[PDB]
Amino acid sequence: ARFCVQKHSWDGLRNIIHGSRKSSGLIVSKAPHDFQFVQKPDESGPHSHRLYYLGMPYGSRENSLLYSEIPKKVRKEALLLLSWKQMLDHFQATPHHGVYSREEELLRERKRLGVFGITSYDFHSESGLFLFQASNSLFHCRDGGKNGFMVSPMKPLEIKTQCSGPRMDPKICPADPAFFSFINNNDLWVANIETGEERRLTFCHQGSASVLDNPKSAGVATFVIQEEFDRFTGCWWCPTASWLKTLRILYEEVDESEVEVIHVPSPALEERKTDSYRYPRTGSKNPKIALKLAELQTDHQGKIVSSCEKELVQPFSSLFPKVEYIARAGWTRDGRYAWAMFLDRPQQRLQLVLLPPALFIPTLESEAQWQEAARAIPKNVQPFIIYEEVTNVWINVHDIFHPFPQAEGQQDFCFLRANECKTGFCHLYRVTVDLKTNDYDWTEPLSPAEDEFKCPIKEEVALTSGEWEVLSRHGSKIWVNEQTKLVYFQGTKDTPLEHHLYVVSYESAGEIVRLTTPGFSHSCSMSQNFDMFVSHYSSVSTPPCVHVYKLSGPDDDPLHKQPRFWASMMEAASCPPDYVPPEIFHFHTRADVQLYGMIYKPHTLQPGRKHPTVLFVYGGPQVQLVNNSFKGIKYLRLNTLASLGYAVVVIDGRGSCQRGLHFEGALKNQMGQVEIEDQVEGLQYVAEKYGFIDLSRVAIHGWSYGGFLSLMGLIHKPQVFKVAIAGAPVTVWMAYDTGYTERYMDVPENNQQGYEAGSVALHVEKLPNEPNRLLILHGFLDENVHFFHTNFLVSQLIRAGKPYQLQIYPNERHSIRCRESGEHYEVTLLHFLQEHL
Amino acid sequence: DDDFWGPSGPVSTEVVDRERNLYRVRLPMAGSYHCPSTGLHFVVTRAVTIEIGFCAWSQFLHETPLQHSHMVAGPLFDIKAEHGAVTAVCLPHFVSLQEGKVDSSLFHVAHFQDHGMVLETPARVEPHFAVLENPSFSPMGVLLRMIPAVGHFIPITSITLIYYRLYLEDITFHLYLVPNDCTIRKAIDEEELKFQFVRINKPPPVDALYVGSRYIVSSSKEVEILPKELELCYRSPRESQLFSEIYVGNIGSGINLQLTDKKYMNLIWEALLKPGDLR
Amino acid sequence: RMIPAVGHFIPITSITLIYYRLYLEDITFHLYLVPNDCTIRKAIDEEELKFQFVRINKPPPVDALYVGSRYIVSSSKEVEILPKELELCYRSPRESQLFSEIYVGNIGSGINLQLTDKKYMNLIWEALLKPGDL
């Protein structure tokens, strides 16, 4: 009755994988990136907008800056497919042979950029100035405003310098586009573009070129912040110039003296040398942080006359105790305040704080002069904790925050805020708060209480509500139009499997209006004028397409402006030759909880049959595997698995994202113990609904959390899973960083019971005695989850005698990048199932 | 014939510039003409100087992301005339339809501009062309959706080209197998000419071949054959096209060149070439 | 935490250009392995024409090769290859253009020329050079 997979040779498997990748259907390899819309005067030509973005038009394997003219009065019956015009004439932006310096390659690994060339850029609208980093250094060009829009590509101008290392993180000053800033050799620098002069404002890094001896850093994000909170900057420009022209820059200075150091092999294997990282493991000490200003004054010709740098009149750690992280920070649009978001250590109390620039005084070591600065501060200057969010599960960190430029109402301060711990779901709120003052005496030090600078709420109006949530992470934002009192956002109001665009009046919280067509998942970006928007969407059965829409309608009622399809920038492909799109389903558990999923039913199926199955699994938080998007290019190996006769079952059990807090809050302090029961419950269900599932031959397979879950299944459910192929697993939980483990697992001092039963390396005696029931894969250069985790597991297997197999990827970090390591990963994957399942 | 075929009489087709194949003919009256060498058809109401020019798809496509969703379906022409001169135009396309395997709605006509490209729907699809009423003079060609370069194995009314070189009691054969396009044929003939490789005409495959399908070239007389398996794929006339080199060195009057599918070993095309048929 | 992304790679088309020069009876061949493009041929044609070299048309590889592969140039022993390997990779047009030269005294009955995959030993190309092409 059963069905036995065909046996192939090793070269045969290599050939079928090479063929399945050749038949991919000529993917674009990149969709148009972040856009910018620039209006044009109508008398200048037939077009009305110019649209700038990033992409690779299949020509080169190099992401590049492109633009397109948005026509005027396009005719309806015929589809218009906009061009992709080059903007930099024959300028390659990847380094020679595609090898990056260690700083920028580590940053690319932190951002997961798998493309070469210009990855991001900074753009000043008024001057129309483009500034970016390409090859090994900074470049800039001008197309927008006074220069007049271009027709032919033009040459980018290299910014000459005298620094040694690489110039990181360029940022154009909004108040004046003649200057910019950057990070060099772990310190901060400000430079001019016209006069070519530079200046250094921070003196923290010795430059001794040894991570061990120079721990301090200024205006740069540490590791745990980059990885587990997704903030890739440490400096921020003040958007207004104060009156000589004075400019401000808020930045942070980190002190990593007491952070534990570890060694990681380097991409140069022959040297047999390692690189050291400040890696704070769970329970250890995080670095010391602080916030500092850095003024600088210029004259009419653009010369930096003075350049000071100030600090809080009290030690940062004194005004704000129980503060472990700086999630986000920035200014308001008038320049009257600088704000930041503080997280405590258990990650259960986030709070917005508002800081006036007047609280920053120059660094005066002479105690006599310092007591003069602490005397000259105005009375109404003090920190303002506008908002505080306390939960019982954990605080997910949002970027969504939009303060309104206040008129001469000295008491009030109104802003939107996507709060999530109030109802259990991420919803927008319009909150107005009165900035109460106390007229502190900064000369005498103060030990702040729990409610020192907390200002009382005047109103708190929910704008959205229901059993759904507003997209707030992974680069999702909101667009607020203050001429019509609206707010555009993205959420899952329709169904948890789709991302749609919405709009609602933030003055009167009326009815929400969807702006995208149902049946797809949309990733869209508005215009700054709120008349056009581009949407990138797809579905399970359709590859992505990128259309541009134009909001038309009567000007008196702006809420109901109808979205008109204007033009297209990319069409679907449908991947016809060998791709059967999976089928989404959903079931209930015995605890009455709805879960979703998908199944790749085997090709060439026959009734009264049974196929070997492969329960693909990630299971970890902040990841949703089942949604109505095109999985055809991301996970196509699962289609190849199905093409041979395997039945792939994906299931997003309790713990995943996009379903609220109380749903995700099932992992708290029980990580590992609960996610498998949802996988086996959702695997036995498919045995009822469908009949081709052979529960005798059940595999399991994951990566970096599913690798951890692959091992937990084989321990807890040895009779359900025959084999188990773990990938870059997390074996011991006491050797992972603070930003992630403490969020969910509550440092071992408190959860030593759960750390024991969650670490899979401490239960090695329950693994199978029989051979050929465990494969292990890990990358050698991995710095996210180090090779130690696999290395310590193998050590525990030998102390008990259990068999295993192992595959190491020497030139691969946490993500398989080169194709030869990708092919060899899949070729060896099929071969294990072919023989031992 | 190369001249436009009309009821009154074939109009003399004068070439302006052979380095770009600029032709220009005078429609002497109203009515409906056609040219088979290009596969074009025209329906006009006056006597008008029409200007026909060839141009490669690639140089207009280098900016647009078209080529990953719609596949090139025919030769891309360039038409010039007065506005109220041409009523109907019929653009050729090599896509096979006779079995109805592919739908008759997925076709489109290209209309290039500085903005981008406009993708019109033909007024009528026919087993060898697409109809367009009242055209706006631009570079125009036929497009087919579904990116069938690897998918849908859409039938292609392909053709086969044979080129030869004698060189003192020897013979060497260049065998091209391409989609049906006048631009590709012309580019191949040009590039072969500067090598003294002259063409010889032979009936094409009378069946609908498939995209990306392998085709083993062989013969009865055992000779030298360089690429055993050709492909049936599309590549712009400005590039170089695959073919097969055959050192036939004929010692017998009839050499039966032949090609065979690789998937099902079915025989498709055969042609026996004799001496004397050359110069 | 995000699931690691396996990279996607597609092979590309390519051509192989054969050039020759005859001094008295010795032949110097110039073999070019280059991705199939337009500008590169009409550039390399002039670059070789400067040194009185000329082209000889031979079919390109049918298979789609990956960018970054290495290929052993093999023949029958009567040839001399100063570079024994070729490399398929994009190249800036205004910059230098790599090739492999071959020295042979007298061709006579024609010489074989083969490219072979370094990693798997695949015969992905061939050419039976004869004096007729000269």
PDB file of C-alpha atoms in Angstrom, chain A residues 570-782:
ATOM      1  CA  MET A 570       7.022  44.480 -12.652  1.00  0.00           C
ATOM      2  CA  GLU A 571       4.704  41.622 -13.597  1.00  0.00           C
ATOM      3  CA  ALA A 572       4.212  38.079 -12.355  1.00  0.00           C
ATOM      4  CA  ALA A 573       5.700  34.950 -13.927  1.00  0.00           C
ATOM      5  CA  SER A 574       3.449  32.145 -12.545  1.00  0.00           C
ATOM      6  CA  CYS A 575       6.402  29.648 -12.503  1.00  0.00           C
ATOM      7  CA  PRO A 576       4.483  27.078 -14.680  1.00  0.00           C
ATOM      8  CA  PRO A 577       6.778  24.014 -15.492  1.00  0.00           C
ATOM      9  CA  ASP A 578       7.163  22.184 -12.128  1.00  0.00           C
ATOM     10  CA  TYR A 579       5.830  24.352  -9.300  1.00  0.00           C
ATOM     11  CA  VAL A 580       2.598  23.230  -7.634  1.00  0.00           C
ATOM     12  CA  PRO A 581       1.723  26.020  -5.175  1.00  0.00           C
ATOM     13  CA  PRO A 582       0.951  24.681  -1.697  1.00  0.00           C
ATOM     14  CA  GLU A 583      -2.522  24.658  -0.155  1.00  0.00           C
ATOM     15  CA  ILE A 584      -3.224  26.627   3.012  1.00  0.00           C
ATOM     16  CA  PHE A 585      -5.442  24.976   5.619  1.00  0.00           C
ATOM     17  CA  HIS A 586      -6.384  25.492   9.249  1.00  0.00           C
ATOM     18  CA  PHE A 587      -7.563  23.342  12.127  1.00  0.00           C
ATOM     19  CA  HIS A 588      -8.300  23.505  15.844  1.00  0.00           C
ATOM     20  CA  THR A 589      -6.521  21.947  18.796  1.00  0.00           C
ATOM     21  CA  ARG A 590      -7.915  20.223  21.881  1.00  0.00           C
ATOM     22  CA  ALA A 591      -7.386  23.504  23.754  1.00  0.00           C
ATOM     23  CA  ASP A 592      -9.652  25.220  21.174  1.00  0.00           C
ATOM     24  CA  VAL A 593      -6.975  27.265  19.419  1.00  0.00           C
ATOM     25  CA  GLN A 594      -6.996  27.881  15.680  1.00  0.00           C
ATOM     26  CA  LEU A 595      -3.714  27.259  13.891  1.00  0.00           C
ATOM     27  CA  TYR A 596      -2.907  27.609  10.211  1.00  0.00           C
ATOM     28  CA  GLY A 597      -0.589  25.661   7.958  1.00  0.00           C
ATOM     29  CA  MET A 598       0.151  24.440   4.471  1.00  0.00           C
ATOM     30  CA  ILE A 599       0.864  21.126   2.777  1.00  0.00           C
ATOM     31  CA  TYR A 600       2.827  20.298  -0.374  1.00  0.00           C
ATOM     32  CA  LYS A 601       0.866  17.265  -1.519  1.00  0.00           C
ATOM     33  CA  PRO A 602       3.066  14.859  -3.488  1.00  0.00           C
ATOM     34  CA  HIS A 603       3.339  15.072  -7.248  1.00  0.00           C
ATOM     35  CA  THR A 604       1.750  12.185  -9.172  1.00  0.00           C
ATOM     36  CA  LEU A 605      -0.432  10.986  -6.320  1.00  0.00           C
ATOM     37  CA  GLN A 606      -2.514   7.802  -6.324  1.00  0.00           C
ATOM     38  CA  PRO A 607      -5.420   6.724  -4.108  1.00  0.00           C
ATOM     39  CA  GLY A 608      -4.821   4.216  -1.346  1.00  0.00           C
ATOM     40  CA  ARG A 609      -1.197   5.267  -0.949  1.00  0.00           C
ATOM     41  CA  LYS A 610       1.138   6.530   1.760  1.00  0.00           C
ATOM     42  CA  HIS A 611       4.046   8.907   1.278  1.00  0.00           C
ATOM     43  CA  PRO A 612       6.970   9.734   3.575  1.00  0.00           C
ATOM     44  CA  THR A 613       6.564  13.185   5.061  1.00  0.00           C
ATOM     45  CA  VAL A 614       8.944  15.961   6.080  1.00  0.00           C
ATOM     46  CA  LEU A 615       7.595  18.224   8.827  1.00  0.00           C
ATOM     47  CA  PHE A 616       9.463  21.402   7.998  1.00  0.00           C
ATOM     48  CA  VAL A 617       9.519  23.599  11.082  1.00  0.00           C
ATOM     49  CA  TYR A 618      10.857  26.856  12.444  1.00  0.00           C
ATOM     50  CA  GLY A 619       8.481  27.384  15.364  1.00  0.00           C
ATOM     51  CA  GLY A 620      10.368  30.302  16.877  1.00  0.00           C
ATOM     52  CA  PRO A 621       8.953  33.719  17.655  1.00  0.00           C
ATOM     53  CA  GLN A 622       8.992  36.746  15.344  1.00  0.00           C
ATOM     54  CA  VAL A 623       8.586  34.467  12.307  1.00  0.00           C
ATOM     55  CA  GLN A 624       5.378  33.518  10.507  1.00  0.00           C
ATOM     56  CA  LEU A 625       5.792  30.733   7.965  1.00  0.00           C
ATOM     57  CA  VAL A 626       2.215  30.354   6.685  1.00  0.00           C
ATOM     58  CA  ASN A 627       0.813  33.408   4.921  1.00  0.00           C
ATOM     59  CA  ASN A 628      -0.757  34.157   1.563  1.00  0.00           C
ATOM     60  CA  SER A 629       2.526  35.139  -0.093  1.00  0.00           C
ATOM     61  CA  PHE A 630       4.535  33.495  -2.861  1.00  0.00           C
ATOM     62  CA  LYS A 631       6.813  30.860  -1.312  1.00  0.00           C
ATOM     63  CA  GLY A 632       8.010  29.835  -4.766  1.00  0.00           C
ATOM     64  CA  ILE A 633      11.468  31.396  -4.722  1.00  0.00           C
ATOM     65  CA  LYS A 634      12.232  31.489  -0.986  1.00  0.00           C
ATOM     66  CA  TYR A 635      11.416  27.852  -0.145  1.00  0.00           C
ATOM     67  CA  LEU A 636      11.511  25.938  -3.412  1.00  0.00           C
ATOM     68  CA  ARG A 637      13.499  23.007  -2.022  1.00  0.00           C
ATOM     69  CA  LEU A 638      10.240  22.002  -0.346  1.00  0.00           C
ATOM     70  CA  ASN A 639       8.737  21.883  -3.832  1.00  0.00           C
ATOM     71  CA  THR A 640      11.615  19.678  -4.981  1.00  0.00           C
ATOM     72  CA  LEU A 641      10.985  17.498  -1.935  1.00  0.00           C
ATOM     73  CA  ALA A 642       7.380  17.273  -3.110  1.00  0.00           C
ATOM     74  CA  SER A 643       8.495  16.645  -6.695  1.00  0.00           C
ATOM     75  CA  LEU A 644      10.136  13.389  -5.581  1.00  0.00           C
ATOM     76  CA  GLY A 645       7.184  12.077  -3.592  1.00  0.00           C
ATOM     77  CA  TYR A 646       7.528  13.567  -0.126  1.00  0.00           C
ATOM     78  CA  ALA A 647       4.613  15.323   1.568  1.00  0.00           C
ATOM     79  CA  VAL A 648       5.839  18.534   3.201  1.00  0.00           C
ATOM     80  CA  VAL A 649       3.847  19.865   6.160  1.00  0.00           C
ATOM     81  CA  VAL A 650       4.467  23.391   7.444  1.00  0.00           C
ATOM     82  CA  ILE A 651       2.606  24.589  10.530  1.00  0.00           C
ATOM     83  CA  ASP A 652       2.813  27.831  12.515  1.00  0.00           C
ATOM     84  CA  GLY A 653       2.156  26.673  16.050  1.00  0.00           C
ATOM     85  CA  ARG A 654       1.725  28.752  19.164  1.00  0.00           C
ATOM     86  CA  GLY A 655       4.638  31.180  19.492  1.00  0.00           C
ATOM     87  CA  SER A 656       4.736  32.639  15.986  1.00  0.00           C
ATOM     88  CA  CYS A 657       3.977  36.271  15.178  1.00  0.00           C
ATOM     89  CA  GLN A 658       1.096  38.105  13.439  1.00  0.00           C
ATOM     90  CA  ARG A 659      -1.529  36.676  15.824  1.00  0.00           C
ATOM     91  CA  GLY A 660      -1.306  38.878  18.917  1.00  0.00           C
ATOM     92  CA  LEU A 661       0.507  38.764  22.230  1.00  0.00           C
ATOM     93  CA  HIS A 662      -1.399  36.178  24.287  1.00  0.00           C
ATOM     94  CA  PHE A 663      -0.956  33.778  21.371  1.00  0.00           C
ATOM     95  CA  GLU A 664       2.792  34.385  21.166  1.00  0.00           C
ATOM     96  CA  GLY A 665       3.090  34.512  24.959  1.00  0.00           C
ATOM     97  CA  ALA A 666       2.876  30.734  25.233  1.00  0.00           C
ATOM     98  CA  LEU A 667       6.670  30.320  25.062  1.00  0.00           C
ATOM     99  CA  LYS A 668       7.352  32.381  28.193  1.00  0.00           C
ATOM    100  CA  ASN A 669       9.847  30.430  30.330  1.00  0.00           C
ATOM    101  CA  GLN A 670       8.788  27.175  28.625  1.00  0.00           C
ATOM    102  CA  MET A 671      10.687  27.560  25.370  1.00  0.00           C
ATOM    103  CA  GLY A 672      11.142  24.152  23.787  1.00  0.00           C
ATOM    104  CA  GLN A 673       8.530  22.229  25.753  1.00  0.00           C
ATOM    105  CA  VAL A 674       5.331  23.428  24.047  1.00  0.00           C
ATOM    106  CA  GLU A 675       6.063  24.022  20.360  1.00  0.00           C
ATOM    107  CA  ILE A 676       6.382  20.326  19.480  1.00  0.00           C
ATOM    108  CA  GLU A 677       2.937  19.385  20.796  1.00  0.00           C
ATOM    109  CA  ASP A 678       1.488  21.818  18.258  1.00  0.00           C
ATOM    110  CA  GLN A 679       3.581  20.263  15.487  1.00  0.00           C
ATOM    111  CA  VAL A 680       2.514  16.694  16.272  1.00  0.00           C
ATOM    112  CA  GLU A 681      -1.112  17.704  16.810  1.00  0.00           C
ATOM    113  CA  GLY A 682      -1.078  19.452  13.445  1.00  0.00           C
ATOM    114  CA  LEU A 683       0.604  16.438  11.877  1.00  0.00           C
ATOM    115  CA  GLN A 684      -1.968  13.916  13.090  1.00  0.00           C
ATOM    116  CA  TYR A 685      -4.750  16.160  11.773  1.00  0.00           C
ATOM    117  CA  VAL A 686      -3.421  15.933   8.219  1.00  0.00           C
ATOM    118  CA  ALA A 687      -3.642  12.155   8.625  1.00  0.00           C
ATOM    119  CA  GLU A 688      -7.421  12.534   8.914  1.00  0.00           C
ATOM    120  CA  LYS A 689      -8.203  15.259   6.363  1.00  0.00           C
ATOM    121  CA  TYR A 690      -5.796  13.859   3.787  1.00  0.00           C
ATOM    122  CA  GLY A 691      -4.960  10.186   3.442  1.00  0.00           C
ATOM    123  CA  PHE A 692      -1.585  10.114   1.699  1.00  0.00           C
ATOM    124  CA  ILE A 693       0.415  10.815   4.888  1.00  0.00           C
ATOM    125  CA  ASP A 694       2.514   7.833   5.994  1.00  0.00           C
ATOM    126  CA  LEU A 695       2.938   8.311   9.738  1.00  0.00           C
ATOM    127  CA  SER A 696       5.369   5.380   9.783  1.00  0.00           C
ATOM    128  CA  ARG A 697       8.046   7.425   7.979  1.00  0.00           C
ATOM    129  CA  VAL A 698       8.018  10.945   9.442  1.00  0.00           C
ATOM    130  CA  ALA A 699      11.091  13.160   9.226  1.00  0.00           C
ATOM    131  CA  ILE A 700      11.625  16.638  10.707  1.00  0.00           C
ATOM    132  CA  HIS A 701      13.827  19.494   9.538  1.00  0.00           C
ATOM    133  CA  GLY A 702      14.620  23.027  10.664  1.00  0.00           C
ATOM    134  CA  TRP A 703      17.220  25.798  10.804  1.00  0.00           C
ATOM    135  CA  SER A 704      18.561  27.666  13.848  1.00  0.00           C
ATOM    136  CA  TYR A 705      15.340  27.319  15.767  1.00  0.00           C
ATOM    137  CA  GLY A 706      13.851  24.427  13.863  1.00  0.00           C
ATOM    138  CA  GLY A 707      17.260  22.853  14.166  1.00  0.00           C
ATOM    139  CA  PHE A 708      16.737  23.289  17.890  1.00  0.00           C
ATOM    140  CA  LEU A 709      13.182  22.003  17.475  1.00  0.00           C
ATOM    141  CA  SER A 710      14.294  19.109  15.270  1.00  0.00           C
ATOM    142  CA  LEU A 711      16.226  17.800  18.267  1.00  0.00           C
ATOM    143  CA  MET A 712      13.430  18.394  20.783  1.00  0.00           C
ATOM    144  CA  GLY A 713      10.983  16.388  18.689  1.00  0.00           C
ATOM    145  CA  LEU A 714      13.318  13.411  18.478  1.00  0.00           C
ATOM    146  CA  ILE A 715      13.715  13.561  22.267  1.00  0.00           C
ATOM    147  CA  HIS A 716      10.095  14.058  23.280  1.00  0.00           C
ATOM    148  CA  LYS A 717       8.433  12.125  20.429  1.00  0.00           C
ATOM    149  CA  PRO A 718      10.851   9.373  19.359  1.00  0.00           C
ATOM    150  CA  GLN A 719       8.014   7.186  18.057  1.00  0.00           C
ATOM    151  CA  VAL A 720       6.646   9.901  15.764  1.00  0.00           C
ATOM    152  CA  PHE A 721       9.895  11.053  14.113  1.00  0.00           C
ATOM    153  CA  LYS A 722      12.220   8.513  12.524  1.00  0.00           C
ATOM    154  CA  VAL A 723      15.025  10.872  11.472  1.00  0.00           C
ATOM    155  CA  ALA A 724      15.881  14.432  12.483  1.00  0.00           C
ATOM    156  CA  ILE A 725      17.970  16.885  10.448  1.00  0.00           C
ATOM    157  CA  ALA A 726      18.936  19.829  12.638  1.00  0.00           C
ATOM    158  CA  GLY A 727      20.519  22.893  11.088  1.00  0.00           C
ATOM    159  CA  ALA A 728      22.720  25.329  13.028  1.00  0.00           C
ATOM    160  CA  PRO A 729      20.867  24.296  16.200  1.00  0.00           C
ATOM    161  CA  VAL A 730      20.826  26.088  19.535  1.00  0.00           C
ATOM    162  CA  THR A 731      21.812  23.302  21.916  1.00  0.00           C
ATOM    163  CA  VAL A 732      22.499  25.107  25.212  1.00  0.00           C
ATOM    164  CA  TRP A 733      20.525  28.205  26.182  1.00  0.00           C
ATOM    165  CA  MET A 734      23.062  29.536  28.691  1.00  0.00           C
ATOM    166  CA  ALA A 735      25.414  30.480  25.831  1.00  0.00           C
ATOM    167  CA  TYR A 736      23.164  32.829  23.860  1.00  0.00           C
ATOM    168  CA  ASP A 737      23.102  36.598  24.109  1.00  0.00           C
ATOM    169  CA  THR A 738      21.019  38.726  26.453  1.00  0.00           C
ATOM    170  CA  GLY A 739      18.842  40.620  23.978  1.00  0.00           C
ATOM    171  CA  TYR A 740      16.949  37.468  22.980  1.00  0.00           C
ATOM    172  CA  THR A 741      17.222  34.848  25.730  1.00  0.00           C
ATOM    173  CA  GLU A 742      16.256  37.226  28.542  1.00  0.00           C
ATOM    174  CA  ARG A 743      13.230  38.432  26.570  1.00  0.00           C
ATOM    175  CA  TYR A 744      11.683  34.962  26.446  1.00  0.00           C
ATOM    176  CA  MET A 745      13.556  32.942  29.071  1.00  0.00           C
ATOM    177  CA  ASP A 746      14.168  35.152  32.112  1.00  0.00           C
ATOM    178  CA  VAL A 747      17.892  34.763  32.973  1.00  0.00           C
ATOM    179  CA  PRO A 748      18.961  31.398  34.484  1.00  0.00           C
ATOM    180  CA  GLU A 749      18.989  32.858  37.994  1.00  0.00           C
ATOM    181  CA  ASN A 750      15.179  32.802  37.765  1.00  0.00           C
ATOM    182  CA  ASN A 751      14.335  30.129  35.170  1.00  0.00           C
ATOM    183  CA  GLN A 752      16.946  27.493  36.004  1.00  0.00           C
ATOM    184  CA  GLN A 753      14.147  24.924  35.850  1.00  0.00           C
ATOM    185  CA  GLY A 754      13.228  25.874  32.285  1.00  0.00           C
ATOM    186  CA  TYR A 755      16.796  26.381  31.096  1.00  0.00           C
ATOM    187  CA  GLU A 756      17.476  22.775  32.099  1.00  0.00           C
ATOM    188  CA  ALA A 757      14.605  21.176  30.177  1.00  0.00           C
ATOM    189  CA  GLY A 758      15.040  23.513  27.207  1.00  0.00           C
ATOM    190  CA  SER A 759      18.725  22.986  26.509  1.00  0.00           C
ATOM    191  CA  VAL A 760      18.801  19.940  24.257  1.00  0.00           C
ATOM    192  CA  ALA A 761      22.461  19.126  24.973  1.00  0.00           C
ATOM    193  CA  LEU A 762      21.579  18.298  28.601  1.00  0.00           C
ATOM    194  CA  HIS A 763      19.274  15.425  27.582  1.00  0.00           C
ATOM    195  CA  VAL A 764      21.530  13.569  25.155  1.00  0.00           C
ATOM    196  CA  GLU A 765      20.773  10.207  26.768  1.00  0.00           C
ATOM    197  CA  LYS A 766      17.211  10.282  25.394  1.00  0.00           C
ATOM    198  CA  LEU A 767      18.329  10.511  21.757  1.00  0.00           C
ATOM    199  CA  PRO A 768      18.042   7.348  19.616  1.00  0.00           C
ATOM    200  CA  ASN A 769      20.508   4.519  20.160  1.00  0.00           C
ATOM    201  CA  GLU A 770      20.110   3.327  16.582  1.00  0.00           C
ATOM    202  CA  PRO A 771      22.368   4.942  13.975  1.00  0.00           C
ATOM    203  CA  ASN A 772      21.214   6.987  10.987  1.00  0.00           C
ATOM    204  CA  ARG A 773      18.573   8.901  12.937  1.00  0.00           C
ATOM    205  CA  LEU A 774      20.339  12.237  13.419  1.00  0.00           C
ATOM    206  CA  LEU A 775      22.079  14.630  11.032  1.00  0.00           C
ATOM    207  CA  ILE A 776      23.731  17.835  12.241  1.00  0.00           C
ATOM    208  CA  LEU A 777      24.716  20.837  10.149  1.00  0.00           C
ATOM    209  CA  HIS A 778      26.417  24.053  11.199  1.00  0.00           C
ATOM    210  CA  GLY A 779      28.517  26.832   9.743  1.00  0.00           C
ATOM    211  CA  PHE A 780      32.046  27.276  11.011  1.00  0.00           C
ATOM    212  CA  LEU A 781      32.320  31.073  10.779  1.00  0.00           C
ATOM    213  CA  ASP A 782      28.906  31.515  12.371  1.00  0.00           C
TER     214      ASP A 782
END
